[PDB]
Amino acid sequence: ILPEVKVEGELGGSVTIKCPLPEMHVRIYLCREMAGSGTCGTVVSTTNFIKAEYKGRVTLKQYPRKNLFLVEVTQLTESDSGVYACGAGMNTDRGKTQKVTLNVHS
Amino acid sequence: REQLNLRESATITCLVTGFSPADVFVQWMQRGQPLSPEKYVTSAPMPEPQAPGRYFAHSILTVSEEEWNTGETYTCVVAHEALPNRVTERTVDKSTGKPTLYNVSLVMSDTAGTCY
Amino acid sequence: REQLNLRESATITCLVTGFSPADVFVQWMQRGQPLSPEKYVTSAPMPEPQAPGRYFAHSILTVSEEEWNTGETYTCVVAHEALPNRVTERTVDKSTGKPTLYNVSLVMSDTAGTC
Amino acid sequence: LHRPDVYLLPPAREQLNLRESATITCLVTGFSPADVFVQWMQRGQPLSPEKYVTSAPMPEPQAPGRYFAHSILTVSEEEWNTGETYTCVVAHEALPNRVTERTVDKSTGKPTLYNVSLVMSDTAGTCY
Amino acid sequence: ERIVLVDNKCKCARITSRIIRSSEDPNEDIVERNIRIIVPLNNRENISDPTSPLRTRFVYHLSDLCETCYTYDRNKCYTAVVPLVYGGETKMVETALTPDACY
Ligand SMILES: *[C@@H]1O[C@H](CO)[C@@H](O[C@@H]2O[C@H](CO)[C@@H](O)[C@H](O)[C@H]2NC(C)=O)[C@H](O)[C@H]1NC(C)=O
Ligand SMILES: *[C@@H]1O[C@H](CO)[C@@H](O)[C@H](O)[C@H]1NC(C)=O
Ligand SMILES: *[C@@H]1O[C@H](CO)[C@@H](O)[C@H](O)[C@H]1NC(C)=O
Ligand SMILES: *[C@@H]1O[C@H](CO)[C@@H](O)[C@H](O)[C@H]1NC(C)=O
C-alpha cells in the first residue's frame, strides 16, 4: 500500500495537488476513478492528453530534483470533486501510487 | 470475423501511431522467415488531427485462409529514432487474435507445504 | 512438516511430564501390542525450575514416511503408580487437528478485479 | 560424518488448555562426532541456563556412527498472545556456517482457514 | 497486519497470513492464509521467444515459491534478434520485445 494523502479547498478559486514522481517511467496521470464501473478515466496525463471537461484549468510540471510532480488547477466547480489518484506506467488501473481526496467547503 | 466467414483470404494490419518525426520503417516476416516486399503495402506518414505535430502510418499483409488457419505466426517489426533499441515488434496468430475459446488447465499442489 | 517433506523418517515424541516420584515406564505399540520396543529410545526423569516435586520424560519413535503417511496411529502409554488404573495413554495421527475448511474464490471476470 | 539435522516443535494443542505454562522442543540429530550444545536466545538475548535443559548426546536407534540429542524449554502460557518466537540454535564442527538458528511462532504452524482467491484476466501479461 | 511469505513476480503469487482475535478470549484464535494468483492468459510458453504456442497448462508447486516463467516484470527489459533484408543484406538486430521498460 501507499499513502492516502488528503487535501481540501476552503472555498473555490484555486487548488494544488502533489504526488511522488517515480523514476524510469515516462507517463504520469491524475485519473479521478469517480465512475460506477470503477475503471479509472485519465483526466490529465503526459504523452499528450487532457479531459474533455477539464481544459484550460489543468497543467502538469514534473520536477526530477525533488522527486515530485506538480499539477495546478484554476478555479473550482461542483464536478471536479471527490477523489483522485496518481501513478505511472502504461495501465491507468494497476499502476496507481497514491489515493488523494478533493473536497471544498463552499 | 466476417472476412473469415467468406473463407477466401485474410488481411492482417499494423497501425503505428503517434511518432514524431516521420520516416518510420516497417517490415513483415512469417515464422522467422522474412517475406517479399511486394506481399504487403505500407502507407506514408500523415498528420494527426487529435495530436498537433504527431504522425501515424498503416501497413497490411494479405495471405490465404489456409495459412492463417495453420497456426502460422506473423510479426510487424518497426524502426524509429525514439525507440530505445531502435527496433520493436508485436506478434499475433490464430489463437491470440480475438479467440473464440479460452482453454485453461489450472493445476496447483501441496497447498499446505512448508512456507516461511 | 519440514521433516516429512524432506523425505526423512518421521519421529514422534511423547512428552511425559509432571510425575512424582521419579518412576515411569513408557511403551510404544501399534495394532494393539508393542513390537520390538527397543525400536524407540526414552530418557530418565529430570527436575524442573518450577514447583517443589516434579519430573519429566521423553520418547522418540522413528518410522518411515511411506508408513506414517499411510495409516496406523502409534499410541503412547505411561505407567505411573499414581494413575486411577496405573495406566494412561494418548494417541495421534495425521488427522488429529482441525478440518481447516477452504474458501476458494475463483474469478473469471476480465473487466473488474486483478487487485 | 554428516550435517547435524535439526528441528523445532511448538507446544501441544491440548497443552494449551490448563493455563499454567507451555514447552517448546528443539530436536538435534546427527552431528557425528557428537559435538553440540543449544543456547535458547530470544530477540538476540540469551535466556537463563536454568530454563532450557539439554541432557546428552544419544545414539540413534540404528547408529552406524550417528547420534542425537533433545532440549526443551519452559515458558508461560499467557505470553503466547505475542509469540516472541523463542529462537533455538545448534553448533557443530561439520557445518559451513557453524550456526543453524531455528525459530517458530504462533503464526507459523498448521493453518486452519485456507482462503485461495485466484483471478483470470487478459491484461495480466505483466506483473505490476 | 498481514505478513508476506511469498511475493513472486514471475508467478504473481502473494502468500500472506493473519491471525484474527476471537470473541474477547485468547482461545480458538483461528489462523488464516491468503493466496492470490493472477493468470496471464495472453502470454506465450517461452516468454522470451514470440513464436512458441500459447500457454495452456499452469502448474503451481506452492512449496517452491515459499526455470520456466509465466509473466513479465515491471522492472526489467526483454530483448531478441530478428533478420532484416534491407538492401538484400540479411542482418540480425536486437529488438526490444518489451519496450517502454528498456528506457
Ligand atoms: C526459449 O528461447 C530462448 C531464446 O531463443 C532459448 O535460449 C537461446 O538459445 C539460443 C540457441 O538456441 C542462444 O543463442 C541464446 O543465447 C539462448 N538465450 C539465452 C537467453 O541464453 C531457449 O532455449 C528457449 N527455450 C526452449 C525451451 O526452447
Ligand atoms: C484443450 O485442452 C485439452 C486438455 O485440457 C487438450 O486436450 C486440447 O487439445 C485443448 N484444445 C486445443 C484446441 O488445443
Ligand atoms: C469466505 O470468503 C469470504 C470472501 O470471499 C469471506 O467474506 C468469509 O469470511 C470467508 N469465510 C470465512 C469462514 O472466513
Ligand atoms: C478471503 O479473501 C477475500 C479476497 O481477498 C477477502 O475479501 C476476504 O475477506 C477473505 N476472508 C477472510 C476470512 O480473510
Listed by start position, the domains of chain A span 6-102
Q: How far is the CA of C21 from the centre of ligand 2 (A)?
A: 70
DSSP-assigned beta bridge partners for residue C62: C11
Minimum distance, in Å, between the CA of residue B114 and any CA atom of chain C: 6
Contact E5, B116 (CB under 8 A): yes
Shortest alpha-carbon distance between residue A51 and chain B (Å): 13
Contact A16, A5 (CB under 8 A): no
Identify the helix (H) or strand (E) that includes residue E63. helix E62-65
Q: Give the separation between CA B14 and CA B61, rounded to whole angstroms.
A: 9
Interface test with C, best of D17, D54, D72 (most C CBs within 10 A): D72
Please identify which residue in the block is written with the cell numbers 498528420.
B47
Resolution in A: 3.5
Asked if A83 contacts A34 with a C-beta cutoff of 8 angstroms, the reply is yes
Which of D96, D115, A56, A80 has the alpha carbon at shortest distance from E34?
D115
How distant, in Å, are the alpha carbons of B74, C7, C85, D68 from that of D62?
65, 18, 34, 11
> Atom 3 (ligand 3): residue with closest C-alpha?
C103
* B contacts of C2 (beta carbons < 8 Å): 114
Which residues does chain D have within 8 Å of residue B104's beta carbon, measured at their own beta carbons?
120
CA C40 – CA C90 distance, rounded (Å): 17
The closest of C103, D78, D108, C106 to E31, measured between CA atoms, is D108
Distance D116 CA to ligand 3 centre (A): 10
Residue A63 CB partners (closer than 8 Å, separation 6+): A21, A69, A70
- List CB contacts of B9: < 8 A, sequence separation 6 or more: B62, B63, B64, B65
Tell me if D118 and E37 make a contact (CB, 8 A cut-off): yes
| Interval between CA C102 and ligand 3 midpoint (Å) | 9
* B109 beta partners: E61
The residues with which B34 forms a beta bridge, in sequence order, are B29
H helix or E strand, kind and range, residue B46: strand B46-47
**Which of chain B's residues have a Cβ under 8 Å away from the Cβ of E84?**
27, 34, 77
- If one residue of C105, C107, C115 were mutated to test the ligand 4 pocket, choosing by the most ligand atoms within 8 A of its CB, it would be C105
CA distances from E74 to A95, B82, E12, E77 (A): 10, 20, 12, 9
- What are the Cα distances from residue E11, in Å, to A96, C104, D47, E35, E60? 21, 18, 41, 12, 8
B112 and D111 in contact by Cβ < 8 A? yes
DSSP element (H, E) containing C68: helix C65-68
Minimal CA separation from E70 to chain B, in Å: 13
Strands C59-63, C10-13: pairing kind: antiparallel
> Pocket residues for ligand 3 (CB within 6 Å)?
C 103, 105; D 113
The count of other CB atoms within 10 Å of the CB of residue C42 is 18
Q: Which CATH number fits domain A6-102: 3.40.50.10800, 3.40.50.620, 2.130.10.10, 2.60.40.10?
A: 2.60.40.10
**Contact call for residues A100 and A80 (beta carbons, < 8 A):** no
Q: A16: how many CB neighbours lie within 10 A of its CB?
A: 10
Breaks in chain B after residues (C–N exceeding 2.5 Å): none
Residue nearest to atom 5 of ligand 1 (CA): E49
**How are strands ordered across the β-sheet holding B55-57?**
B16-19, B55-57, B46-47
Q: Is E32 in the pocket of ligand 4 (CB under 6 A)?
A: yes
Q: How far apart are CA D46 and CA E43, in angstroms?
A: 52
D88-123 in b/e form (b: 16+ CB < 10 A) is: bbbbbeeeeeeebebbbbbebeebbbbbbbbbbbeb
Supply E80's cell numbers. 531478441
Q: Which residues of B71-102 are buried (b: 16+ CB within 10 A; e: fewer)?
A: eebbbbbbbbeebebebbbeeebbbeeeeeee
Residue type, E2: R
Contact D109, D10 (CB under 8 A): yes
Amino acid symbol at D62:
Q
> Which triple of cell numbers denotes residue B92?
499475433
Beta bridge partners of D119: C107, E38
